């Protein structure tokens, strides 16, 4: 198992200190010689280390979202896909969310004698998704490279920070195809991962 992991390391990246730093926890955590031998033979804890290295990636963040957050993400992705430039805003996202809720309700037959959340409550969901970097502002440079660039950036006032919360332009990081790859099919909103 250790040889397989070493071969994988060699194939993937050839900076040896990376493998050194990967090995260090295995030696450090060992409590007894028998435990050390069993761990180094099984060599399973490198998989745990590697998955924790991957836990805050796009898939890891996406697996933690809620139902309403996921639905709004899907609706935003649909608008981005339909757009020529991929841009979208809060108004279009909520319009699509309302439209898809209406469609889901309609496909449920009416009985002879699912909530559309209010536009104010959806603001918290939007704020959550903007911070988790699923969205991004239209031309967000993000982290500047040097102190002088940060100075000129903090001196200037971007229009995107002044215009209302409902009309800020965003672009998408996870394209709808990636969502359909990742989103489980058991999800109720999965059927809308297609156009």
């Amino acid at each position: 198992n250790l040889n397989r992991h070493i071969r994988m390391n060699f194939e993937t990246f050839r900076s040896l200190p990376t493998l050194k730093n990967s090995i260090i926890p295995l030696v450090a955590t060992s409590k007894n010689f028998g435990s050390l031998c069993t761990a180094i033979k099984s060599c399973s804890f490198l998989d745990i280390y590697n998955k924790n290295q991957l836990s805050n990636n796009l898939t890891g963040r996406l697996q933690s979202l809620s139902d309403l957050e996921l639905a709004i993400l899907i609706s935003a992705a649909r608008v981005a896909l339909r757009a020529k430039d991929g841009s979208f805003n809060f108004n279009l996202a909520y319009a699509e969310y309302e439209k898809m809720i209406k469609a889901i309700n309609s496909r449920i037959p009416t009985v002879a004698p699912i909530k559309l959340w209010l536009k104010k409550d959806v603001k918290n969901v939007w704020e959550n998704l903007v911070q988790l970097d699923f969205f991004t502002e239209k031309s967000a440079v993000g982290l500047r490279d040097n102190a002088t660039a940060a100075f000129y950036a903090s001196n200037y006032q971007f229009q995107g920070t002044m215009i209302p919360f409902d009309l800020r332009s965003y672009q998408m990081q996870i394209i709808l195809q990636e969502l359909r790859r990742i989103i489980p099919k058991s999800n109720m909103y999965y059927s809308w991962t297609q156009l």
């Binding site: 450090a28 957050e69 319009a95 918290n124 959550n128 988790l132 982290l143 660039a149 940060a150 009309l167």
Partner: protein, 416 residues
């Protein structure tokens, strides 16, 4: 060398990783260490929880959240390290260096070197865990900053008995990915699951709410006789589960927002408690229903405006969302941001829609609207309305223009 490990729930892997990379011998610890996770992940909690079980580790705590820029961050390191070294080993004769003299990282290295030389008389080599919480949370931040603290202690003389062992905490993933080639030991914090958040809130904020004055009133008011602490615990616990299951799709999985919702709704939920409400929390749910039907995070005829102002704000919306092509035909893109226009258009449309000429009250109402910020301009500082370069746009949504039109009996719904 051996370090005991606290049993931090839902952070066991990271507690083991901090049992690693942290020990008494500076020859068994790295020069840099990064713990990463988004807000509300427990990194500040877990790191302090681990340090609070092993006092012999000499830790120095700083927060770039308070320290606005890099100069305070540099100066605080020298100040707190010097004070901590005095607190730990006082008997050695030392001379003070002013932390306000640290204007450059080179000067920080110089001061650290001088202080360690002053402690050279120590018998054993010892660690100094300088801790920075939320490095990327620093507001005056740039990409090149972090390398300066990555590659710092190698400029120190390795003969020194005191070795600095930096620890960083970070929020964003786009910050880490610029420094992956350095192979810095990294410990990751993923967002909690719902089952984890609910149990964390139950374990943390249960007893604090359980004995608040609001219940200290209601227990006596309802003359509860057989009450015990276990009943208090269960009744308080049910509240957190109800709020979580009600507002999980709204808050998400964040502890802070759930705590705030609990804080706001707890007195009102307690108010509904009667003699028959306890020992049947279902009735408690079935009586405080309206608490669980609205978020109640709102801070509180919404606009009461003059008629001239109302028609000016109708005409401005018409200007902002009607294409200029139609001004010669109709009078003779809602989801998009409003387009700009000129005052010449606004005055003409206002004259064409009011049921007025150019008395000063019209311009006064327009300037009042601008001061109210119901209409925006293309500038931020040194407003110069009369300059021809300024352009105007609407800063009011459609839902309010509709009510204004209803209140003035106007039919904007037929112009689009």
């Amino acid at each position: 060398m051996n370090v005991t490990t606290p049993e931090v729930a839902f952070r066991e892997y990271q507690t083991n990783c901090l049992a690693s990379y942290i020990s008494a011998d500076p020859d068994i610890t790295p020069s840099n260490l990064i713990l990463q996770g988004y807000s509300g992940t427990g990194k500040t909690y877990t790191l302090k929880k681990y340090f609070n079980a092993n006092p012999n580790l000499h830790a120095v705590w700083l927060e770039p959240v308070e320290l606005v820029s890099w100069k305070p961050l540099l100066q605080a390191i020298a100040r707190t390290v010097q004070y901590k070294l005095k607190t730990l080993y006082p008997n050695i004769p030392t001379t003070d260096y002013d932390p306000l003299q640290v204007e450059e990282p080179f000067l920080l290295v110089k001061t650290l070197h001088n202080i360690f030389v002053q402690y050279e008389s120590l018998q054993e080599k010892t660690c100094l865990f300088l801790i920075l919480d939320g490095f990327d949370s620093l507001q005056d931040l740039d990409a090149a900053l972090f390398n300066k603290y990555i590659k710092l202690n190698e400029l120190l003389p390795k003969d020194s008995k005191i070795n600095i062992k930096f620890i960083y905490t970070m929020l964003e993933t786009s910050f880490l990915q610029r420094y992956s080639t350095h192979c810095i030991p990294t410990v990751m914090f993923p967002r909690y699951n719902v089952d984890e958040v609910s149990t964390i809130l139950v374990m943390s904020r249960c007893g604090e709410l359980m004995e608040d004055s609001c219940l200290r009133k209601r227990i006596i008011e309802e003359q509860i006789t057989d009450c015990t602490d276990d009943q208090f615990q269960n009744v308080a616990a049910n509240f957190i589960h109800l709020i979580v299951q009600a507002f999980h799709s709204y808050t998400g999985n964040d502890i802070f927002a759930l705590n705030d919702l609990i804080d706001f709704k707890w007195p009102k939920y307690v108010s509904r408690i009667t003699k028959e409400n306890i020992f049947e929390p279902l009735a408690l749910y079935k009586s405080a229903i309206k608490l669980f039907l609205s978020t109640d995070d709102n801070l509180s005829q919404t606009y009461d405006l003059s008629i001239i102002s109302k028609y000016l704000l109708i005409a401005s919306y018409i200007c902002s969302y009607l294409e200029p092509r139609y001004d010669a035909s109709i009078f003779s893109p809602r989801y998009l941001q409003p387009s700009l226009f000129a005052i010449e258009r606004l005055l003409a449309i206002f004259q064409a829609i009011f049921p007025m000429k150019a008395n000063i009250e019209v311009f006064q109402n327009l300037s009042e609207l601008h001061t109210l910020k119901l209409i925006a301009t293309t500038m931020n500082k040194n407003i110069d309305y009369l300059s021809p370069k300024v352009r105007w746009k609407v800063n009011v949504p459609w839902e309010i223009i509709k009510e204004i039109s209803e209140s003035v009996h106007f039919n904007i719904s037929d112009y689009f």
